[PDB]
Design a protein around this nucleic acid. Structure first.
Ligand SMILES: [Mg+2]
Ligand SMILES: [Mg+2]
Ligand SMILES: [Mg+2]
Ligand SMILES: [Mg+2]
Ligand SMILES: [Mg+2]
Ligand SMILES: [Mg+2]
Ligand SMILES: [Mg+2]
Ligand SMILES: [Mg+2]
Ligand SMILES: [Mg+2]
Ligand SMILES: [Mg+2]
Ligand SMILES: [Mg+2]
Ligand SMILES: [Mg+2]
Ligand SMILES: [Mg+2]
Ligand SMILES: [Mg+2]
Ligand SMILES: [Mg+2]
Lengths: 38, 136, 131, 141, 92
RNA sequence: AGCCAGGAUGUUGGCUUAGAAGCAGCCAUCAUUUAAAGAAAGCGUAAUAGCUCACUGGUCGAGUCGGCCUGCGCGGAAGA
């Protein structure tokens, strides 16, 4: 995953979740869109 | 890169960027990028933010630039002591108070306008907002 | 979806068709094809024109709000998908059988062809019509 | 009638017998041979016209050959000899390319009625007229 | 196009800002041979009113002390950057 | 919101004949059958096919996607 300070919803299947304080963007279609932080 | 074609004086005082802006209403175009924050925009930043707009909306549409530099900023070279004269003019800046309309746009959709102004707003140091031309 | 006026217009339009109608027929494409669309509705053109509104909206309270005013027996038909194919020219026309005949001609299923209301009857394939 | 087994609508100008660069691998993708679209292909084509693209159903089975029923040539290829300009589209709204009236397209509309689907003739008339709207040919009604 | 509006008693910089920081804003009604009338009114209404294009053209009837005064919005002061009104000049 | 449904015959449409075929780029952005369908928002193809979504149906059936105005927070946030 990426750890950029400005995570955002790249594709349609991307989904924002707040796990353990950290904001993460989990995705079904492309694992490339998986990203943490920010 | 925007700059005054000839001026009275080469070097100008620092001054104080205070008060509210005057170019507040959207005059020419339908939409506009208003400056929320206080600051000063360089000649490069304006060009960079213009390029980001003009390329987003393509050949279509019409853009204005309500702000212009006309304030030379001096800078002292590296490894130079204090005094021994005012420094040389490096770049040119426009002082931006809150409320000042920076850019104005016309002949495009409202949906595609906001996205074009985001790309410009990203280039600029000052915090900005979208404003529409209200009739009186 | 649009406002209560736009929804009311559609039903009040359907109620006026029952006033100047007679026979009807169900149809449920639980695996339709648009090549089928233009047979059962192509037929309606071969009858005469556009007027034959199949109006497939039998929802428990949508076309069944117009039921209380016109033909109360069709409330029980509500369960499972149904299309109220209202007719106009010719009393008891040939549009009833054609849904059952098309069902065999590549349409998977057709609501178990239960029928609507002329003698207040149920699931009956009836060739006995005026021709 | 059977569902989707392996039928596809695909071939260039029906006069072009046995196309290898235009189609080639597609019609010979399945167990059907390359020779089948040459002898049997020009059997029905020579009745109507050559130098004209026309489609056909390719319902392939496990026997060897396939059953088929031809349909009808499409809108704008017919609107070349009928329309006038060989080029169709380019910049219609910015620059009107050509123009056609209702009288021609209404008359041309009904000739395909064996394949065409609708109620009245006037119904498919504004469709097969309409096909002109979308070639930079704003219909002269 | 009808708004209830109170009459002003305190007027200046201190009063106006206190007012503006209370979901309201100052306006004024003037025209004809009569004297001008300084008019306090609510913000959240008039903010929603100005969205319609009729506001800056048609006649508005402002309700003050029972009496309904017929006016047109001549001039208006926007807040520099925030989307909110500071003041309205109602010509009679 | 979910859930078995439908979501077209010509469109290999002209185009630079190597193809653009609802979806590289051109623009048009048909109108019929009609509960509905843009000659199409995305995926997938040498291009097709094909799968989705717009929409429309029927089931369970009640409150619900979104934008400013703000009160406090969250990440951004590594040194001997
Ligand atoms: Mg980091
Ligand atoms: Mg990194
Ligand atoms: Mg953990
Ligand atoms: Mg100059
Ligand atoms: Mg001073
Ligand atoms: Mg000044
Ligand atoms: Mg001025
Ligand atoms: Mg005084
Ligand atoms: Mg003070
Ligand atoms: Mg006077
Ligand atoms: Mg805070
Ligand atoms: Mg830290
Ligand atoms: Mg740090
Ligand atoms: Mg660090
Ligand atoms: Mg660390």
């Amino acid at each position: 995953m990426k750890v950029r300070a400005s995570v955002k919803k790249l594709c349609r299947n991307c989904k924002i979740v707040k796990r353990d304080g950290v904001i993460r963007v989990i995705c079904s279609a492309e694992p490339k869109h998986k990203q943490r932080q920010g | 890169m925007l700059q005054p074609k000839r001026t009275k004086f080469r070097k100008m005082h620092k001054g104080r960027n205070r008060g509210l802006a005057q170019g507040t209403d959207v005059s020419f175009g339908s939409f506009g990028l208003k400056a929320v924050g206080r600051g000063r925009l360089t000649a490069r930043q304006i060009e960079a933010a213009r390029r980001a707009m003009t390329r987003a909306v393509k050949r279509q549409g019409k853009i204005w630039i309500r702000v212009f530099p006309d304030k030379p900023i001096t800078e002292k070279p590296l490894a130079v002591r204090m005094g021994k004269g005012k420094g040389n003019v490096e770049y040119w800046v426009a002082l931006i108070q809150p409320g000042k309309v920076l850019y104005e746009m016309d002949g495009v959709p409202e949906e595609l306008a906001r996205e074009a102004f985001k790309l410009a707003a990203a280039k600029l140091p000052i915090k900005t907002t979208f404003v529409t031309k209200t009739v009186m | 979806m649009a406002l209560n006026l736009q929804d009311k217009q559609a039903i009040v339009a359907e109620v006026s068709e029952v006033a100047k109608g007679a026979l009807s027929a169900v149809v449920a494409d639980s695996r339709g094809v648009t090549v089928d669309k233009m047979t059962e509705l192509r037929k309606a053109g071969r009858e005469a024109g556009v007027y034959m509104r199949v109006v497939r909206n039998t929802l428990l309270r949508r076309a069944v709000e117009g039921t209380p005013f016109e033909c109360l027996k069709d409330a029980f038909v509500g369960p499972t998908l149904i299309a109220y194919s209202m007719e106009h020219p010719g009393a008891a026309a040939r549009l009833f059988k054609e849904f059952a005949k098309a069902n065999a001609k590549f349409e998977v299923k057709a609501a178990a062809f239960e029928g609507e209301l002329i003698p207040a009857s149920q699931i009956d394939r009836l060739a006995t019509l005026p021709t | 009638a059977k569902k989707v087994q392996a039928y596809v609508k695909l071939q260039v100008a029906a006069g072009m017998a046995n196309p290898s660069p235009p189609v080639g691998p597609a019609l010979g993708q399945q167990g059907v041979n390359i020779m089948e679209f040459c002898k049997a292909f020009n059997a029905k084509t020579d009745s109507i016209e050559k130098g004209l693209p026309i489609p056909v159903v390719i319902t392939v089975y496990a026997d060897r050959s396939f059953t088929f029923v031809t349909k009808t040539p499409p809108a704008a290829v017919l609107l070349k000899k009928a329309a006038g300009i060989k080029s169709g589209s380019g910049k219609p709204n910015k620059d009107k390319v050509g123009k056609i009236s209702r009288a021609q397209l209404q008359e041309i509309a009904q000739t395909k009625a064996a394949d065409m689907t609708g109620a009245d003739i006037e119904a498919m008339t504004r469709s097969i007229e309409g096909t002109a709207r979308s070639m930079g040919l704003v219909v002269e009604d | 196009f009808t708004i209830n509006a109170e009459v002003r008693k305190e007027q200046g910089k201190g009063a106006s800002r206190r007012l503006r920081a209370a979901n309201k804003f100052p306006a004024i009604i003037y025209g004809g041979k009569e004297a001008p009338l300084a008019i306090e009114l609510d913000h959240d209404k008039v903010m929603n009113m100005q969205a319609k294009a009729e506001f800056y053209s048609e006649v508005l009837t402002i309700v003050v002390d029972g009496k309904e005064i017929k006016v047109k919005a001549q001039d208006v002061q926007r807040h520099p950057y925030k989307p909110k009104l500071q003041h309205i000049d109602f010509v009679r």
